[model samples]
Target: PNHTIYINNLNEKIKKDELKKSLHAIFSRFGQILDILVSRSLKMRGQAFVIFKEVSSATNALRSMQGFPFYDKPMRIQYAKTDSDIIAKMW
Candidate 1:
């Protein structure tokens, strides 16, 4: 199922751009990831999503990346079932 996952509980002081840029290592080391969508939010602070090509792969990534630190910030990984419009809204 396609979904827009919302991840929070991040270190708020870290810049969104920094977060996205730093995720390459996490994805590459875990599985065959096509993309990771880290939303740059103006309305919300310290939140984003990591999208994988397949749900199984995403699930693997979620497990592998939990408690992993990106830019001195720990991660929150979970599945989301929602509309594409919600993801677009994040953009």
Candidate 2:
């Protein structure tokens, strides 16, 4: 139930490619990455769903990265709304 983390911020500096890349590089630090689902740049331009291999993996990151700064913006976090599925779960 806690295998992912939802991130929020602006597309201040980086674009789609590096934004995803940056997220992967930073978030994968505290956990084993299972999946990364990013919305199309046209719609939601500043968010993505990051999933960890295990529940604990995400937990470590949830706190460690919480309030951490990134892209010169407040690196805030939202509770993970994901599981093992690799596709974007629209609900």
- lDDT top scorer: 2
Give the CA lDDT, 0 to 100, for residue 30 in model 1: 53
Name model 2 segments beyond 4 Å from true. Answer: 41-43, 82-91
Residues 1-91, candidate 2, lDDT per residue (tens digit)?
A: 4887887775655766777788888887776788887776454556678888888877888788887778787777766653544244433
RMSD of each: 3.8, 4.1
What is candidate 1's CA lDDT for residue 6?
Answer: 48
What TM-score does candidate 2 reach? 0.76
lDDT by residue (17-72, candidate 1, tens digit) is 77666665556555555555654456556666766656666666677677767667
State residue 77's C-alpha deviation in candidate 1, in Å. 1.3
Best TM-score among the predictions, by candidate number: 2
**Candidate 1: Cα lDDT at 22:** 64
**TM-score for each model:** 0.64, 0.76
